């Protein structure tokens, strides 16, 4: 593989970062959402509204049906598709085809709302209908002779880069800080503390790892559990100093508009445990990442029931290394994460963990 050829291989902002993938014989080009929060390679199989193209299995001579379907259901929506096998080519990075599993969607509800498929890059554990259905990245690692590592940069806050097989040095400056993967399903990592404008929230660190704290390129916003979300909102409102935001701004039902004072809004830092448990490092997002333009703006953080989801709101500030080989997630500040001549993210450390508990995951 060539890692330089994978630079700028993603398009979009916004509406998701998608990779160009060629499927079947002869190849059919599809636009595929890069999703580190799921583990199925699934594409559109029928026309549908809101999509331009789709994978026609009947036009691929190499396509083979497994003779079973898969139904995936989420909170908001769902889909059902035929499970098959076919040859796939990633032109930006590789020059050979790979045999992989593929789900071809024949029906869905609230799923397709520029991409026409999803590339699940999480672990075998989450694959449906079971973990025996070999994931795309497991097929690629084996068949392409690449290390069990990929890294992602989002430049939409300018597309992005998915480097399959390693780390590209030109995509970051400064040090990479690694946090352990606590559980291999989603990219679950341990959050120790949340800090708003220098002030730590007064919560038990178990509140941040509710069911799980995960790094998910397929989630748009920084999703926080309700209690944590309420604490962040209160801390942002207190630290802002200017006349107060609407409740509709916090809940996402109303936009806040200006003809904007970035200096008046606080920084949001997330502390992650280092591979050495005595130390931690923080990933910091400036106001420009969580007060998102739509000049009118929407709030880039939302509540959740289960899971603290480190979505695109945060990932747009950092080059994120999914080091599956060494069971860790790396973070470095993105040079492309710059708005109006100001770096919109920071990374720093080390910091002591002697106050907090040794295991914040329940």
């Amino acid at each position, epitope marked *: 593989a060539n890692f330089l050829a994978m630079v700028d291989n993603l398009q979009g902002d916004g509406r998701g970062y998608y990779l160009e993938m060629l499927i079947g014989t002869p190849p059919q080009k599809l636009q595929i959402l890069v999703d580190t929060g799921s583990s199925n390679f699934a594409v559109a199989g029928t026309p549908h509204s809101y999509i331009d193209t789709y994978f026609d299995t009947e036009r691929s001579s190499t396509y*083979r049906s497994k003779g*079973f379907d898969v139904t995936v259901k989420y909170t908001q929506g769902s889909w059902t598709g035929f499970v098959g*096998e076919d040859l796939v080519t990633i032109p930006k990075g590789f020059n050979t085809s790979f*045999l992989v599993n593929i789900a071809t969607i024949f029906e869905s509800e609230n799923f397709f709302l520029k991409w026409n498929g999803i590339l699940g890059l999480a672990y075998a554990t989450l694959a449906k209908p*079971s973990s*025996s259905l*070999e*994931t795309f990245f497991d*097929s690629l690692v084996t068949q392409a002779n690449i290390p069990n590592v990929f890294s992602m940069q989002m430049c939409g806050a300018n597309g992005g880069s998915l480097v399959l097989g390693g780390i590209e040095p030109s995509l970051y400056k400064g040090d990479i800080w690694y946090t352990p993967i606590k559980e291999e399903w989603y990219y679950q990592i341990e959050i120790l503390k949340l800090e708003i404008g220098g002030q730590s929230l007064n919560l038990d660190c178990r509140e941040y790892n509710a069911d799980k704290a995960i790094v998910d390129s397929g989630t748009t916003l920084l999703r926080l559990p309700q209690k944590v979300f309420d604490a962040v909102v209160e801390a942002v409102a207190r630290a802002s100093l200017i006349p107060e935001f609407s409740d509709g701004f916090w809940t996402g039902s109303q936009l806040a508009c200006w003809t904007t004072p970035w200096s008046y809004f606080p920084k949001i830092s997330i502390y992650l445990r280092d591979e050495n448990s005595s130390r931690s490092f923080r990933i910091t997002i400036l106001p420009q990442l969580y007060i998102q333009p739509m000049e009118c703006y929407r709030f880039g953080i939302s509540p959740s029931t289960n899971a603290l989801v480190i979505g695109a709101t945060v990932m747009e500030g950092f080059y994120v290394i999914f080091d599956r080989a060494q069971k860790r997630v790396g973070f470095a500040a993105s040079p492309c994460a710059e708005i109006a001549g100001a770096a919109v993210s920071e990374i720093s450390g080390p910091f002591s963990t002697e106050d907090v508990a040794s295991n914040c995951v329940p």
Partner: nanobody
Amino acid sequence: AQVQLQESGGGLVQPGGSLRLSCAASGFTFSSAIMTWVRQAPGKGREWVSTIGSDGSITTYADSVKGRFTISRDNARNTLYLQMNSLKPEDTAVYYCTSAGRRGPGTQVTVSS
């Protein structure tokens, strides 16, 4: 799913010799699983050998083994095979099966004059 794999059929052969590797599978629906052979020698990089689709019709090979090695499977017997012909000293490695991120312990192939 506990994907269990056990390879057999390796050995010490001369240059131009032959082996038939096999791999027994259990704990999953072998007839629906993509199967892959990989090789690994000490001090060298991991090398993909060949992949076979679940029904056996689709097969792919590395350029280093093309025309010499043949991959196949018997889904009724839950067994993957690698027929190895025209063996060279550079084919010396542990050969192992992989499926869905799991692998077998492998079987040693040694080619020496």
